[PDB]
């Protein structure tokens, strides 16, 4: 399967656009967190089917599919937020009916920190002019490089991760820029993964505290995806 055809499969695995069905209106600490947990829960469902459409994912042992997803879900959600927010400086496009500002994150303690991380990383991808196909490979890579018969699944994973890496290199090569510039671009995109992982670790620590306080309705899927981490 050529790099271009692998990227096409990622395009076809893209989850549908999600809305929380909230009539437009100002945000409060309650409505905001409730809207975020509600959105994360909906997205997690689509994320699982997304992962299964990635060639070879379903061939990994069940132990690996679960551990990869439990490990990377938050980062994958945030990478989606960044691609969606790219054409809208200053805003975090969590969803069409869930658009927030930096000042909106002030009502909730500890979240302004997280919004700033997300906005900064988004601003970075924006100046690099992240392309849709790059976004697709990077997101797949986050899933396949997150965690870590018995040894068989292992090679399957390395093979799959290498295949998506190969696809990202291909995408960059098609931009038709200098070879040296292709290298600088690949390194610049990958170095941002560290920042997504960081915002992710902070985002989950904050959600965890919210849960322990029972201040937010933590739906079933979101709840277990969360506890798996704590575990």
């Amino acid at each position: 399967l050529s790099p271009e055809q692998l990227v096409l499969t990622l395009l076809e695995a893209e989850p549908p656009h999600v809305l929380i069905s909230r009539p437009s209106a100002p945000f409060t600490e309650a409505s905001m967190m409730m809207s975020l947990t509600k959105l994360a829960d909906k997205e997690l469902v689509h994320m699982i089917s997304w992962a299964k459409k990635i060639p070879g994912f379903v061939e990994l042992s069940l132990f690996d599919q679960v551990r990869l997803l439990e490990s990377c879900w938050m980062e994958v959600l945030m990478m989606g937020l960044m691609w969606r927010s790219i054409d809208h400086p200053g805003k975090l496009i969590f969803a069409p009916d869930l658009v927030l500002d930096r000042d909106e994150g002030k009502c909730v303690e500890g979240i302004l920190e997280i919004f700033d991380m997300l906005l900064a990383t988004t601003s970075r991808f924006r100046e690099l002019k992240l392309q849709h196909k790059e976004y697709l490979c990077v997101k797949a890579m986050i899933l396949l490089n997150s965690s870590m018969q018995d040894a068989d699944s292992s090679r399957k994973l390395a093979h799959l991760l290498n295949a998506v890496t190969d696809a990202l290199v291909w995408v960059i090569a098609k931009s038709g820029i200098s070879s040296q510039q292709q290298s600088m671009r690949l390194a610049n995109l990958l170095m941002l993964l560290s920042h997504v992982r960081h915002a992710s670790n902070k985002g989950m620590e904050h959600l965890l505290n919210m849960k322990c306080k029972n201040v937010v309705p933590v739906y079933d899927l979101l709840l277990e995806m969360l506890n798996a981490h704590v575990l």
């Binding site: 699982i48 089917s49 069940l62 679960v66 997803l69 079933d220 899927l221 277990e224 798996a228």
Partner: peptide
Amino acid sequence: KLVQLLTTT
């Protein structure tokens, strides 16, 4: 459940 969604369609 993560597992039931990974095993059904």
